[PDB]
Amino acid sequence: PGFVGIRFCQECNNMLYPKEDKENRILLYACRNCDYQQEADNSCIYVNKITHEVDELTQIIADVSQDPTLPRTEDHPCQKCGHKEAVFFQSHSARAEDAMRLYYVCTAPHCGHRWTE
Amino acid sequence: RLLLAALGRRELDDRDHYGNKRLDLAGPLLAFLFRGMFKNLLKEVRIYAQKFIDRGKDFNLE
Amino acid sequence: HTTLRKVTANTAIYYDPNPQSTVVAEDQEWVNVYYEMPDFDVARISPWLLRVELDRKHMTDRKLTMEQIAEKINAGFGDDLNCIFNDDNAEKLVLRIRIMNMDDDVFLRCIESNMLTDMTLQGIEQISKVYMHLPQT
Amino acid sequence: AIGQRIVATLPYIKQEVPIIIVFRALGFVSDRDILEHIIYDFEDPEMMEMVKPSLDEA
Amino acid sequence: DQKLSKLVEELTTSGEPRLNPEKMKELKKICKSSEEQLSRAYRLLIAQLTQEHAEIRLSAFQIVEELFVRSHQFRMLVVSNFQEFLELTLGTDPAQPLPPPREAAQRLRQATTRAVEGWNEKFGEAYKKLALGYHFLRHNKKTFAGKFEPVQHWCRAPRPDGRLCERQDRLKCPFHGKIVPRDDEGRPLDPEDRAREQRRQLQKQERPSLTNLKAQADTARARIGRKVFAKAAVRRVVAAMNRMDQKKH
Ligand SMILES: [Zn+2]
Ligand SMILES: [Zn+2]
Ligand SMILES: [Zn+2]
């Protein structure tokens, strides 16, 4: 399915709202401030993911390895560069309070690889 | 910040945390109290000066 | 109590003006098979489509079927709001909701919200959860 | 619709006022500019949906 | 006098953009013959206007437009009570709004104005109240988890196309009701089921002008909106969301 992001007008830099031309029934995105309009390609207006089935690796940032508080391990090497050291923690976020799955971040600079076993 | 709290990306702040808390000793307490009192004094002085000006005579500061 | 939001995994609203060639590719077979027999007219079909996919584990746990879900939504929304469902054998159980002859997009958004909030598929209302156990006393 | 709406309380203002009106008052009337000030990354769609109702209301 | 009454009702309830000429012809033939009767017709018009249903008002204004230009007596009576006609037609009264239909109310107002300029251009000087009125409008108002999915039976119902139903439904097929076992020719194995289906087939063989305010709501799109937008439903929407808010917290 995927997610849908908003579109901006090229004239006033305002968001394009969903609209439709009955004559051709082609998904249009018409800015409701001015007369500008555009032809969509996603063919999707709104999605609501209840299962919130998303990857925490996207939210995980690679600069967290410089935290003198989180634990470190040498038993989970980085797959991208083979570095032995890694920093691990939990999801520690809402809708992810369970699933104690450990999220590992490579300690070596310029790699910042984030992965999960 | 309100958004991140809504999606749960950030945790709601707790009042009991002392990082979110500050202490008020004699210094700030007196300053705050004095500030109100000094203004009251200014007003009193302004009232006296205004009434003397309305009466037409200059007012002695003392 | 089992409301709709409970079993629904994901909800999506598309623009699919041509039911014969649906926007989503993994529906063509059963959607065209459904639209072969004109039990419902195609002219009255609204072009906005609400595509909701369910959770199979919730299917099995609640013993809820596609026929029952369709019957419940039909009883709730007359012949006005027709819904088409696949067989209970695919890897992804998904059914489509369209209005039948404010913008229809926002109207369908409100309809989806109402279904998810207060579409009682089964169970006694104002009963949250039932705990099942043997008494040791 | 029934979306979540972001609204702000300004001192000495008797009635509660939406944040988008406040941003327009500060001089950022472009919806894109308001979005840059609100959300820093435009590739995150969830925040954009979350602020959609405020833009719609204003 | 009875005949003129019937014509007035017919024009108001015609429900068309333009009133039927024959009937208008008849009204005209009745109006001239007697000046008193013309005055009575004028009277009737205003009464019809002061009721409801702007579409009927719009139909009434077409009658008023015709009797103004071709009758000086009627031309005087309209001027004599031009204030009331101004509220009834243009909807300039601060209290009374234009009744439904809304699109018909738009047509009544738009068509009313275009008359007034011509009304004033041709008869403004002679009739002083009319001249004041046109200026007034223009300028003032502007875990068990038992999961099994065995599906071997088929509906096998005889479709009108000659092919058996291939739908795989556990209990009920939506196009054919309950599902019963059938052979290769789509005949229920139970003779009782065959008899019941035959009985069902026999049962199947045995089987103003404008839309009122209630009639306008009588449709599909309105019914689903009424159910969705309900005081109990919205509260149930909030109450259901409150319970997940407790789970979220
Ligand atoms: Zn624009
Ligand atoms: Zn690495
Ligand atoms: Zn069948």
What is the pairing mode between strands A26-30 and A37-39? antiparallel
Residue B15 to residue B7: CA distance in whole angstroms: 21
Instruction: Tell me which residue in D30, D42, D45 faces A14 most closely, judged by beta carbons.
Output: D30
Residue E130 to residue E114: CA distance in whole angstroms: 15
Residue A45: closest CA among A14, A18, A7, A26: A18
Residue E44 to chain C, least CA–CA distance (Å): 40
Radius of gyration of chain B (CA): 24
- 3-state secondary structure at position E85: helix
**Do residues A46 and C12 make contact, with C-beta atoms less than 8 angstroms apart?**
yes
Residue C4 to residue C15: CA distance in whole angstroms: 23
Q: Are residues A17 and A63 in the same domain?
A: no
Residue C49 to residue C100: CA distance in whole angstroms: 11
Q: Are residues A29 and A61 in the same domain?
A: no
Q: Which chain C residue's Cα is nearest to A4?
A: C12
Residues 6 or more apart in contact with residue A46 via CB below 8 angstroms:
A4, C12, C13, C105, C109
In the PDB record, what is the listed experimental method?
cryo-EM
**Distance, CA C2 to ligand 3 centroid (Å)?**
28
φ and ψ at residue A44, rounded to 5 degrees: -150, 130
Examine the fold and report which residue of A13, A30, A48 is the final residue of a domain before the chain moves on: A48
Q: Are residues A86 and A61 in the same domain?
A: yes
Identify the H or E element spanning C54. strand C48-54
Total domains, chain A: 2
Residue A27: closest CA among A37, A35, A36: A37
**Do residues C76 and C111 make contact, with C-beta atoms less than 8 angstroms apart?**
no
Q: Is A103 exposed, middle or buried (0-12, 13-18, 19+ CB in 10 A)?
A: buried
Whether the bond between E101 and the residue before it is cis, its omega within 30 degrees of 0, is yes
Q: Tokens 């139970």 identify what position? A: E190
Q: Are residues A61 and A101 in the same domain?
A: yes
Residue D20 to residue D27: CA distance in whole angstroms: 11
Residues in chain A whose beta carbon is closer than 8 A to a beta carbon of chain B? 59, 93-95
Task: Tell how far CA C55 is from the center of its chain.
Answer: 12
Q: Tokens 């068509």 identify what position? A: E111
Residue B9 to residue D55: CA distance in whole angstroms: 22
Residue E66 to residue E57: CA distance in whole angstroms: 14
Residue B12 to chain D, least CA–CA distance (Å): 17
DSSP D33: H
Chains that touch A (3 or more CB pairs under 8 A): B, C, D
- 3-state secondary structure at position E234: helix
Q: Are residues A42 and A61 in the same domain?
A: no
Q: Are residues A68 and A18 in the same domain?
A: no
Between vectors from CA E123 to CA E46 and to CA E118, what angle results, nearest 5°?
Answer: 80
Which amino acid, C28? Q
Tokens of E24: 């208008």
C chain contacts of residue E170, beta-carbon cutoff 8 Å: 65, 67, 88
E82-90 vs E72-80: helix crossing angle, rounded to 10: 80
**Do residues E97 and E91 make contact, with C-beta atoms less than 8 angstroms apart?**
yes
What is the maximum span of chain E, computed from C-alpha positions, in angstroms? 96
**Do residues C66 and C27 make contact, with C-beta atoms less than 8 angstroms apart?**
no
Which amino acid, B38? F
B chain contacts of residue D3, beta-carbon cutoff 8 Å: none
Instruction: Tell me which residue in C10, C16, C48 faces A50 most closely, judged by beta carbons.
Output: C10
Strand segments, DSSP code E, in chain A are 17-21, 26-30, 37-39, 44-49, 72-73, 86-89, 103-106, 114-115
Residue C10 to residue C1: CA distance in whole angstroms: 20
Q: Are residues A9 and A64 in the same domain?
A: no
- 3-state secondary structure at position E97: coil
Residue E57: closest CA among E87, E36, E81, E29: E87
Q: What DSSP string describes E137-190?
A: IIII-----------------B-TTSPBP----SSEETTTEE---B-TT--BSS
Strand partners, C97: C50, C83
Tokens of B10: 């950030």
Strand partners, C14: A44, C49
Q: Are residues A111 and A61 in the same domain?
A: yes
The answer, for C76 touching chain A at a CB cutoff of 8 Å, is no
Residue E161: closest CA among C36, C42, C28: C36
A chain contacts of residue C101, beta-carbon cutoff 8 Å: none
The answer to whether C112 contacts A50, with C-beta atoms less than 8 Å apart, is no
D 19-48 residues inside an 8 A Cβ radius of A: 30-33, 35, 42-43, 45-46, 48
**Do residues E53 and E210 make contact, with C-beta atoms less than 8 angstroms apart?**
yes
Q: Are residues A108 and A61 in the same domain?
A: yes
Strand partners, C45: C100
Residue E71: closest CA among E42, E114, E108: E42
Q: Which residues surround ligand 1, an ion (CB under 5 A)?
A: A 9, 11-12, 14, 31, 33-34, 36
**Distance, CA A103 to ligand 2 centroid (Å)?**
14
Residues 6 or more apart in contact with residue C83 via CB below 8 angstroms:
C70, C73, C74, C95, C96, C97, C98
**Distance, CA E17 to ligand 1 centroid (Å)?**
38
Tokens of E129: 């109240």
CA–CA distance from E16 to each of A53, E7, E10, E107, E218 (Å)? Answer: 58, 15, 11, 12, 21
Q: Tokens 């555009």 identify what position? A: A38
Residue D30 to residue D23: CA distance in whole angstroms: 9
**Do residues D31 and D56 make contact, with C-beta atoms less than 8 angstroms apart?**
no
The answer, for B9 touching chain A at a CB cutoff of 8 Å, is yes
Identify the H or E element spanning C84. strand C81-85
CA–CA distance from E187 to each of B44, C108, E165, E191 (Å)? Answer: 106, 42, 12, 9
Identify the H or E element spanning E235. helix E231-248
Residue E245 to residue A79: CA distance in whole angstroms: 40
Radius of gyration of chain C (CA): 16
The answer, for A95 touching chain C at a CB cutoff of 8 Å, is no
Q: Are residues A73 and A99 in the same domain?
A: yes
CA–CA distance from C37 to each of C94, E165, E177 (Å)? Answer: 20, 11, 15
Q: Indicate which CATH number applies to the domain containing A72.
A: 2.20.25.10
Residue E45 to residue E8: CA distance in whole angstroms: 8
Domains defined for chain C, CATH in brackets = 1-122 (3.30.1360.140)
DSSP E87: H
Residues 6 or more apart in contact with residue D27 via CB below 8 angstroms:
none
**Do residues E40 and E2 make contact, with C-beta atoms less than 8 angstroms apart?**
no
Task: Tell how far CA E36 is from the center of its chain.
Answer: 37
The answer, for B7 touching chain A at a CB cutoff of 8 Å, is yes
CA–CA distance from E171 to each of C61, C62, C73 (Å)? Answer: 18, 17, 17
Q: Which chain E residue's Cα is nearest to C44?
A: E220
Domain that holds residue A42: 4-48
What is the pairing mode between strands C81-85 and A103-106? unpaired
Q: Are residues A34 and A57 in the same domain?
A: no
Residue A96: closest CA among D50, E248, B5: E248
Q: Are residues A73 and A30 in the same domain?
A: no
Strand partners, E158: E164
Ligand number nearest CA of D32 is: 1
Q: Which chain D residue's Cα is nearest to C108?
A: D1
**Do residues C10 and C65 make contact, with C-beta atoms less than 8 angstroms apart?**
no
Residue C76 to residue C1: CA distance in whole angstroms: 17
Which amino acid, D58? A
**Do residues A106 and A57 make contact, with C-beta atoms less than 8 angstroms apart?**
no
Best A3, A56, A93 residue to mutate vs chain B (most B CBs within 10 Å) = A93
Residue C96: closest CA among C25, C33, C40, C27: C27
Which amino acid, B32? F
